[PDB]
Design a protein around this ligand. Structure first.
Ligand SMILES: O=P(O)(O)OC[C@H]1O[C@](O)(CO)[C@@H](O)[C@@H]1O
Ligand SMILES: O=P(O)(O)OC[C@H]1O[C@](O)(CO)[C@@H](O)[C@@H]1O
Lengths: 280, 314, 287
């Protein structure tokens, strides 16, 4: 109950490249290793405490799928841990599938524009330079955590011309961008995405100039929310935990998104919804 | 053998370009039916490798002719679904054949089922504007012309002026037609009530690769908010997304655009002449299929029940 | 030639509320106090003054003064009589733009509804005056201001606007598209108004406007008469590198061009203007 939080923090510690939701799944499944009737009640408390320490959408989404990817099977605890281990085996290969689908969408000599920092966009570009494509990356230093500089330092090792553009200068450099690639922190039920603050005005500018806005999310980031504006995003997700507002996420409408390169194949935004309807 | 020589005859005809799209799909089905009959194969795996290899060479022959690739993928889906319901199976060689025959009668009725929905989308005193010469759209406009009376503006496609024979075909059936010059699409767009076009290929996101004027057409249709109807059957439905790695453009000789009699300036001028033009799905209103009239945003689902996701890349 | 720069810096020092272009006007007018080579001296003063500030307003505000005095030389020619008609006409020009912000405030504060919630960019002494006149007319509203990296002028504005007892929120620079639905209208102060009616303001104004037209929020610009520069950009590259730059690689432009289709109205000195109307006025300010 308390060892769960420190074990989740550990699963952050020995690998930061592993996603937050995947860390939640790993600590959740290791909690499942330790009556099995109504065990959803035990795991729901684990989900609530795990979303307490991490405010991200993916932790309360990917953990929700594991609450029901084990509950689609309905002793049964052994088939539960077997199917859960299969679930973990098939989300360790998400970023590779996304990279394989998405690096073919980057033309040679292109000039992409990305946002804050994401292990998926970084992997898309890592696979694109491994396919002997050459391009340049514009990354916005996203306030307040400055993870644009972290991405550009993590992407300069790939020998890519990367430019840490200002957070305000998206509308300036949007015309110098062939395509926009962002990593979603959660994909809501209408096909839009919930991503680090500033993704929305990246999209709104991009559609103002008809630049394709590509999103590279994963399968476990499919959350059941249906926002209609930036109000409808819950305060659980926006606020991470001289007056200042300071959210950390904002909703991007599905009309602004050209394609999603999720784990389960390339989707139009309209193709997201039944991929949530199927999981129900 | 007769079959092998017919395979490279088909491949070389594809490369050189020597028929309509429905005839392309029918000949592809006949060829693939021959491939699965006359070759010797133990189980379905070897035959899927064989069909995949031959589809790879027919696709690499003319990559912009995707009806042959689509029908290779449809046969592959048929193979893996008529082997799934039996899971070396003796009757499998028969079973696929029957499904192929059920595909070949799904074909040769594609144009009738698209033409049946003509009256639901064309009204009296309408003005329709089309671009190329597609047999699907002329049957659509000639089934709506039996009952109602309307005006059709066939904007010719400039390099190969092929809207000329379209407007000759339509004027013989009594539709009052107008031939345009392809520069006037934005000009006469104010009058036009619906735009009904055909495609070479419907890509997997609802976008379509069509005759070279259709994007310049669709931008005008979106500007004047004219609905862009697309009449295209399910062999023209290809599971490829518009990626930059694969080239979807086809470029033909510049003699179609700038003739060889220009002389010395041809050593300095770079003439291109593409024949296909990408139309993104947000400029489309409907796809009148042979199975209905569903929206572009449904096309992904039509992929999943036509082609297996392992068969996308061959 | 060097004391010119020192005097311009001094006019910055003992007057921070005075605009940069007005400081250029004052120091150039004193330089005028010290035939046709004098026009060349004033052009050299333009070059040296724009070389140390590089704002659009300085190279436009001083450039109208190269024309507001040379218009009088079209009427008559002299050697020292022309210099004195120059100084009594330049003093009129200078005292006619000391009243600019008040006129803009009087025109623009009637466009803020009671109980509104405006959104503003970095720091404008004109937007601040528009809100100062709007609270002096007993209107109450909310102000959203972006912190507007790299110099954090939004915090300076919100500290300069909290004394007015207005609920002001220093929103993050990335979060314009988030709070944009929480905004009734957008008021920004242009650093220069180009010939098509669009504006050149601190970086991030463009995406404030593009979001605005995405939600049909009115985007109001409060510029002044001397900020009318004769440029005609077509994209963000067409803004000169003189104006964009004040000096894992950083880019940092400091200004960007906002298209005139994104702007609802301009509240300039010389009346409320449609973005088209600006072009006429520019013709009238250069014949
Ligand atoms: O690293 P991931 O899992 O791709 O997260 C994607 C998004 O989540 C964030 O890292 C935090 O919001 C964003 O910077 C990023 O866009
Ligand atoms: O109103 P001011 O102080 O004359 O300047 C207006 C604009 O110029 C800047 O001060 C610098 O570009 C911006 O902060 C402001 O938007």
């Amino acid at each position: 109950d308390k060892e769960l939080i420190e074990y989740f923090k550990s699963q952050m510690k020995e690998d930061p490249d592993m996603a937050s939701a995947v860390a939640a799944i790993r600590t959740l499944l290791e909690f499942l290793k330790r009556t099995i009737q109504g065990l959803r009640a035990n795991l729901t408390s684990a989900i609530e405490t795990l979303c307490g320490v991490d405010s991200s959408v993916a932790v309360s989404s990917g953990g929700e799928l594991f609450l029901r990817f084990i509950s689609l099977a309905s002793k049964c605890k052994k088939i539960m841990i077997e199917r859960g281990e299969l679930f973990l085996r098939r989300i360790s290969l998400s970023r590779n599938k996304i990279a394989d689908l998405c690096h073919t969408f980057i033309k040679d000599g292109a000039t992409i524009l990305t946002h804050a920092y994401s292990r998926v966009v970084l992997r898309v570009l890592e696979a694109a330079v491994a396919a002997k494509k050459r391009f340049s990356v514009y990354v916005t230093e996203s306030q307040p955590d400055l993870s644009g500089k972290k991405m550009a330092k993590a992407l300069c090792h790939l020998n890519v011309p990367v430019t840490v553009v200002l957070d305000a200068a998206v509308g300036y450099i949007m015309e110098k961008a062939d395509l926009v690639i962002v990593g979603a922190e959660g994909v809501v039920e209408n096909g839009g995405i919930i991503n680090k603050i500033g993704t929305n005005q990246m999209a709104v500018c991009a559609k103002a100039q008809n630049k394709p806005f590509y999103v590279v999310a994963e399968s476990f980031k499919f959350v059941r929310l249906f926002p209609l504006n930036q109000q409808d995003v819950p305060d659980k997700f926006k606020y991470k935990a001289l007056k200042e507002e300071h959210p950390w996420v904002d909703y991007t409408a599905p009309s602004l998104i050209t394609l999603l390169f999720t784990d389960l194949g390339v989707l139009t935004p309209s193709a997201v919804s039944d991929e949530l309807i199927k999981l129900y | 053998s007769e079959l092998s020589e017919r395979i490279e005859s088909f491949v070389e005809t594809l490369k050189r370009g020597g028929r309509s799209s429905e005839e392309m799909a029918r000949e592809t089905l006949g060829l693939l039916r021959q491939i699965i009959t006359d070759h010797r194969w133990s189980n379905a795996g070897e035959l899927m490798e064989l069909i995949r290899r031959e589809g790879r060479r027919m696709t690499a022959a003319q990559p912009s002719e995707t009806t042959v690739g689509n029908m290779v993928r449809r046969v592959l889906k048929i193979i893996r679904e008529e082997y799934g319901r039996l899971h070396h199976y003796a009757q499998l060689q028969s079973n696929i054949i029957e499904a192929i025959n059920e595909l070949l009668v799904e074909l040769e009725g594609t144009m009738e089922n698209i033409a049946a929905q003509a009256l639901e989308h064309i009204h009296s005193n309408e003005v329709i504007m089309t671009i190329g010469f597609s047999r699907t759209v002329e049957a659509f406009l000639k089934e709506a012309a039996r009952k109602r009376k309307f005006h059709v503006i066939v904007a010719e496609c400039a390099p190969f002026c092929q809207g000329h024979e379209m407007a000759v075909n339509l004027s013989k059936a009594g539709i009052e037609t107008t031939v345009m010059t392809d520069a006037a699409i934005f000009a006469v767009m104010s009058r036009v009530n619906k735009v009904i076009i055909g495609t070479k290929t419907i890509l997997a996101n609802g976008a379509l690769r069509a005759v070279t004027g259709t994007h310049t057409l669709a931008l005008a249709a979106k500007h004047h908010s004219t609905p862009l109807i697309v009449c295209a059957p399910m062999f023209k439905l290809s599971p490829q997304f518009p990626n930059e790695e694969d080239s979807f453009h086809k470029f033909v000789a510049p003699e179609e655009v700038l003739p060889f009699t220009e002389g010395d300036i041809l050593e300095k001028v770079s003439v291109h002449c593409p024949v296909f033009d990408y139309v993104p799905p947000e400029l489309i209103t409907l796809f009148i299929s042979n199975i209905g009239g569903n929206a572009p945003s449904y096309i992904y689902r039509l992929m999943s029940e036509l082609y297996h996701p392992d068969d996308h890349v061959l």
